[PDB]
């Protein structure tokens, strides 16, 4: 019932914001104290007996946590007194924040990040990207920087309950506003291009058999098959949910291969085939990133 004591804040790693408090001085000895905590506008409510709460949030906005004490875990039980402690983003020049900061995990091997300079940016500023995940001993500074045009970037290695990777872009001079980015280990994944093993015909049906990347299994991937014809000037495209090997007559016996059949295709003309691969919502969090197209494989009568 009374207010909690010593509701303070701290920042571990890069984006780990931790609220910690102490039990109320006014106390009922006949009470199992549960703490009702929520953020702005009744967001992310949680009732827990712990005197601490930590979340992973990009510190780009001032967010506050309200803390109330309870004796019951019921919904009807609403604390009369709540203490709120807020935390603001680090100091820096108004429009110095780097824009369009994105990070893509390439084939579960390396993370490549890119961003654009802020509107209010000094010409002599030097960008520095820092990353961190649970497995690391401390905050690491990505040194493999790159510059693709007007874009600034940095790519670091990253090999494979819910844990994510924190990314901070900040100048060591401490003149510009540090920008943050949280990347879940199950999202922003761009696989490698697959490898076509064989193309086989059955009347007017074309069986395409390829191989997925080594770090990805069959059921975790959404497929796209491209079939370009020379004579008919056709640029067909097929989207496949899942592709399994059905007819062994027109397929190799490699057990890591997926198979798709394209109907209404003639050997009379030359047919070029490419395969593109992305992750589905069944195994990963995002299905927006396609891999690069596979190498071309042709079949049929040449011109």
């Amino acid at each position: 019932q009374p207010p909690v004591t010593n509701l303070s804040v701290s920042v571990e790693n890069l984006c780990t914001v931790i609220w910690t408090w102490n039990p109320p001085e006014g106390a009922s000895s006949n009470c199992s104290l549960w703490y009702f905590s929520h953020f702005g506008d009744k967001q992310d409510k949680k009732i827990a007996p712990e005197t601490r709460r930590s979340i992973e949030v990009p510190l780009n906005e001032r967010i506050c946590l309200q803390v109330g004490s309870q004796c019951s875990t019921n919904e009807s039980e609403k604390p009369s007194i709540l203490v709120e402690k807020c935390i603001s983003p680090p100091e820096g020049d108004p429009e110095s924040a780097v824009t369009e900061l994105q990070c893509i995990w390439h084939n579960l091997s390396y993370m490549k990040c890119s961003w654009l300079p802020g509107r209010n940016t000094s010409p002599d500023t030097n960008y520095t990207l820092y990353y961190w995940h649970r497995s690391l001993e401390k905050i690491h500074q990505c040194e493999n920087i790159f510059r693709e045009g007007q874009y600034f970037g940095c790519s670091f290695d990253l090999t494979k309950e819910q844990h994510s990777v924190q990314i901070m872009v900040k100048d060591n001079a401490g003149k510009i506003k540090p920008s943050f980015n949280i990347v879940p280990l199950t999202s922003r994944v761009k696989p490698d291009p697959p490898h076509i093993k064989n193309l086989s015909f059955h009347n007017d049906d074309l069986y395409v058999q390829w191989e997925n990347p080594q770090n990805f299994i069959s059921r975790c991937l959404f497929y796209e098959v491209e079939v370009n014809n020379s004579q008919t000037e056709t640029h067909n495209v097929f989207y496949v949910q899942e592709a399994k090997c059905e007819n062994p007559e027109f397929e190799r016996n490699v057990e890591n291969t997926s198979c798709f059949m394209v109907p209404g295709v003639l050997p009379d003309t030359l047919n070029t085939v490419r395969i593109r691969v992305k992750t589905n919502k069944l195994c990963y969090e995002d299905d927006k990133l396609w891999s690069n197209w596979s190498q071309e494989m042709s079949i049929g009568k040449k011109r």
């Binding site: 009347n203 007017d204 049906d205 098959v225 008919t232 056709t234 067909n236 097929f238 989207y239 496949v240 949910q241 899942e242 592709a243 798709f260 059949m261 109907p263 209404g264 003639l266």
Partner: protein, 183 residues
Amino acid sequence: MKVLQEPTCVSDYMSISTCEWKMGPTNCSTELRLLYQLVFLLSEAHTCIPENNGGAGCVCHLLMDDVVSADNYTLDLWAGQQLLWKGSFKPSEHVKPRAPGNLTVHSDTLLLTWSNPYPPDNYLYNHLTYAVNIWSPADFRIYNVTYLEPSLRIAASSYRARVRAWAQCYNTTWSEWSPSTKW
């Protein structure tokens, strides 16, 4: 008076589940009532008035709101006032997808375009395998469609086409054949 064949129910995984059985000759619409309810808690029974197949044969149409794989339905075939047959039914185990439609032929290349009979909300909206039969009778060539877009493009090398669907993962039976299109 006595149930000869036990009710064989099939579902289209959306709102409807067709049950069918065989009885001597009787009036199922008058005497027989099919009571069905979901095993899910807060049980609410439902009464079905079965239509007649013909010659000691009746067919009942069960109505649902949504269908998930875990759904299990207990069946109670009430003969007048006395229970004739008791059993259960699982829609996901015996799925029969509803037939596709709106098939239109063609024209640079011969093209066929039909429609997905399921709404985007449904689960089969992305898990339906099609099969187009194009004949003139043994001149037919069957095509298998396992990609998303319900399109079929072939070359020209007096015909009639038809389309049916099949859900791969649920190991269903083939859907009924769509109304053919002559050209």
